[model samples]
Target chain A: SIITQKIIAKAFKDLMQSNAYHQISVSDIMQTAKIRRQTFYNYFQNQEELLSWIFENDFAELINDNSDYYGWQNELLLLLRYLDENQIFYQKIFVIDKNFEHFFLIQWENLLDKVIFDQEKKSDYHWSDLEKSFICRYNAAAICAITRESIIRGNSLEKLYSQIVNLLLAQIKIFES
Target chain B: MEKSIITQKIIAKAFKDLMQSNAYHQISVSDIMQTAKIRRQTFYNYFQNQEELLSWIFENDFAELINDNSDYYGWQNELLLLLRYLDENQIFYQKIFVIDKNFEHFFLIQWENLLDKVIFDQEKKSDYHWSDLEKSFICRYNAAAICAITRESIIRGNSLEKLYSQIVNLLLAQIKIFE
Candidate 1:
């Protein structure tokens, strides 16, 4: 199913590269994939579901597969690079569905939480659960706000990528001061 | 043509439906006039873009809701009215909020100002008032909380009457977290 879905997602991604999101129908995506139009329904309910599935699975694999070699920060840099190149695609996707935030937040918060925990384990300072939770939320909100502003305002992704260094080190490097 | 005010009112009413049903950016100028039979660009004759249209419509209705009801419109006077206005226009505010970053930035600023004043008053002019930096941070943190809960309440439904009561009650009690 993943192999099949991968083919479809590649087709979908390319279509969005040149066409408006709403303009790219299921028929269009299937045609681009060289599959029957009805085959789309077997994999996804609507374009919305395909949009969600692509972001959820694809971004995770990008990070998960490279976590050891590139490290999380480098992985995020590459991800943001993709985002900068596909700015229009994400501009539409951000407002496409409210649930997209739920999905995006899960990925983002988990990334930040694990990053925070790993550094805390090596560092001298330790925060209680409640304090650490608060810090995690604060950073997560800050990061999401920056990314949203970038997509909406057409800011370059480096502003976000640069801040990633500062934010990821917020607890570990700067908390002592 | 009808009076300018009346034409704007009719456009707003039509656009309100459009706003309720569509994403802020995706809904186009022509969409508003499809059945109303105005030219596609007639939107410019009234408001600038989707954002301005929303600001105009929301402010006019919300202002009418307040101005028609009472004078003074103090803290005690305001929360109930605001809560109800938002409760009544559920989908409108939800979309407006995520319009996506435009309205959100404005609402956060407004809430921060409101909470900053509330915190000052709750301190009873005592030394417990926070530093300017901390106050803003606290205001933003709580504003983000209010934004989240209000957005969810609009999407999922809530006892908004009871909602503001709890909200006001908690703010008046003062936050106990230490620096």
Candidate 2:
């Protein structure tokens, strides 16, 4: 993170609260961040990308924190908690673009690969390599949806966990069996 | 609404046709009326403004697509069928998504219904308890993900077969049934 660039990005994200995205400009961002012209271009190609990058990088870090785990259940809960803490940053970008779900496939693939590796030594779904892959990705997506809603509607992460666990545990048994 | 049937026809024509020719914000009531040869007042009578007309077109098309198609084997098939419908009506579908900023929620809401229906079918149960808040949250996420994936596919102009399979595989891979 270029300190001033990060500073400018945060300023833009913050202003989105009181003003529309279009109403805020590069000049506004620079002025708010107290940065210079060269510094803005040095870090960002444009406003939308910069905002997306800030959010994506931060999310990548959060997802990374739970990258290695033994239990799919607890790790999944931890992932949701991380998202809960940073819901505001996510909502701002996603609210405007209407395309927030695009990133889930990539993130979940990463989570599944790790989680499945941890599971292989203990449990067997008896899934072929391909079936295992599909189950991991789809269930990760289904659960991630639970995480997303908890943040959007201002529910606690713990509540999201119970609802999601019930939904998946109930459905997935039939699915896996 | 029947009194304005011709007016509706013209607007629908204008909307479906303009998907190939004009931007959302750029498509005017006069242009729509001109295509239908209906008067400006008639357009106003049928729709309060552009947004109303645009949404009307979408709601109509969506109903048409999903009218009798409610089989949900799993995420893969549901996801694929939804994408197939979009490809069948690419212009109208593309216009609704790319032409404006406000229809985002509608985009997700529809997908939520799709997912809920799919879930109901898979459970082999006629009924299940999904609190309004719970349904709202699930719909928002599924909608967001579906919309995002669909948008990316549109941007790349990926073929329906290619996109359908990719999304099907992606959704399946993310699911977890046991602990």
Candidate 3:
């Protein structure tokens, strides 16, 4: 049977405190959690499988936390805060280098989709796939760089948020009219 | 002279040979022995096993790769160096990322170590007080960011020259921060 997530989470905290990300093994986690290795797999695929959840909100609450959003700037700031709150969670998994999920990449794709979809609705200038992809990737990298430096480094979020907003918003403006 | 020094060279040669063509898993002691012209016994006497050899091969190469040439501290040159090394050794190095399952541990360790070395070197010159944990965190993040993006670029078959340009730009930005 799968162990309680509480037990698994506690084991996670224990492992985080005791070992470096690379040093900690699934066997070590199983031993700490007092569960079978298979059970660990059943609940979570691997270390990061369990870890990324900390960044997520309760799935039961499917609605957006804020119904009325102003623009991309507000949406981005909210996401930044959410990331800052869970900075340590990412700091651990990401340190492994080879382990980064396409978190930033996917985020950028969604942003591009929204922008392009809106443009399509208005029958605006025809943009090629290359142009859209370029915008997505460049903007993604820029946002990730800011998140890496400010949020991951434990800088004040309010300060970092403003800086990210101004810079990213400026880029989005360059993207639009 | 230390036995490990000799062992290190043996491991490095085996790794270079492996780099020429073959995945890490596909390589064997016999292959390494044949390439290095050393006996299997010598390989075992140095490394506990193939896994240890793999880890050491990456660590030792990266350590030398990072520290060997300070003259090229210029980031543009650094990026070219890294890209050139990867391109030159695509077979062995490519699988570390492409296979993703078995090689994850190996890749992460080397990435972490190089980042650690970079930050450790940076700390020596800076006046900031960095706790062990803080230093550890920075190295890890830097490694993740650089390696992840670089690997994606490779998977997309982006030209090494193009990557060098981006890395140089990133490094130039960093130089401004450094100053």
Candidate 4:
């Protein structure tokens, strides 16, 4: 089943590379993957589910795998670079759904929560929940909007992400006082 | 051509005038044309439907004030003007924003375009040498920031003046290093 799922996903992504998202049907995906149209229903509901699964599977380990070793600053750069590497897939998917997972707002908010929580614990600040939520949303929106635009433009993060890091820390330090 | 342009403005204004008296869904094409003193069928030639006309008013009137970037008006002045316009027309936008999801998407896109232009223009005129990636990143970042706070003000009837000052400070604080 692992092999079968991987094969179908690979074919789906491969289709995205060449074909418009709306134009590529389940038949097209199944035929391209050599899995037959019926097998797709067993693994996923539709293209939307496939897209959701890809993001969840691909990113589920980002913080778990890297945050302890590399820190979230690098983890964020990792996130952007990951999106950069899969730029075409994302650009294609935008046509089907614009508010996909609230356009990544929830993930950014979670990441910001962890980031702010950790920083506040080790540092000198009383993190109000109100301020915490606002900070999360403010930065999350910034990250989501910028990355989507960058993906559409075929731009690369190139691991170049210091300005935002400073700004994030700056907010923490200011409120900590 | 001039008369055609005037008629469209007449229709748009009539729609706005009628909207103040009733909710958007409660009004109709006939009501708008009636208010404008024009034949109702003329609405088809100018706009496909009520929603399309709302979009026209939105993109033309609301958008025009928010998006001006004359060098004479500093960004502060520009932001002040936008906030003021949003405040003055608060009731209008409260209804428009919830008309559907597409308007919010349009708001973000419209803002992204404006910020993208603002960044490019500033980059050209100043000593800034930001790479394409950084410029794009910064542009969309500010666009979302601007859109989120602006949207919050309209949708919830929050205070735009306070948020405007706060956003301006955040932007200035973050961006002063580049200048």
lDDT against the true structure, per candidate, is: 0.65, 0.62, 0.57, 0.73
Off by over 4 Å in 1: A36-42, A68-70, A174-177, B1-105, B111-179
Identify the superior model by lDDT, candidate 2 or candidate 4.
Answer: 4
Poorly placed runs, candidate 4 (over 4 Å): A1-4, A20-42, A45-48, A63-69, A101-103, B1-21, B25-81, B84-88, B98-137
Candidate 2 lDDT over residue span A1-177, tens digit each: 556656886787777767777888888888888877667888887887786787677657655655454366776666677666556755655577766666755676666666666556455555567556655555566555655655676767766777655544443344343
Top candidate by lDDT: 4
Sliding window of 10 residues with minimal summed lDDT for model 2 chain A: A168-177
B1-179, model 2: which lDDT tens digit per residue? Answer: 33536558567877667666777677787887777677778887779888888778777655544434544445455556667767765665666666576666676667766666645554563444555665555455455556655654565666555556544443332232211
Task: Order the candidate numbers by lDDT, best to worst.
Answer: 4, 1, 2, 3
Cα-based lDDT at residue A92, candidate 4? 74
Report residue A69 deviation for candidate 2 (angstroms): 5.6
TM-score of chain B of 3: 0.66
Cα RMSD, model 1: 12.5
Worst 10 residues of 3 chain A by lDDT: A54-63
TM-score per model (chain B)? 0.60, 0.63, 0.66, 0.81
Q: Distance (Å) between predicted and true CA of A26, model 1? A: 2.2
Report model 4's TM-score to 2 decimal places. Answer: 0.69
Off by over 4 Å in 3: A1-72, A82-104, A112-177, B1-7, B70-75, B98-142, B154-158, B174-179
* Inter-residue clash pairs, candidate 4: none
Tens digits of lDDT, candidate 4, A1-177:
568877888888989998887788989889989977898889899988888777776676565565453666777877777787778888876666767738476777767777876776577776567666767777877776666666777877544368578667755665676
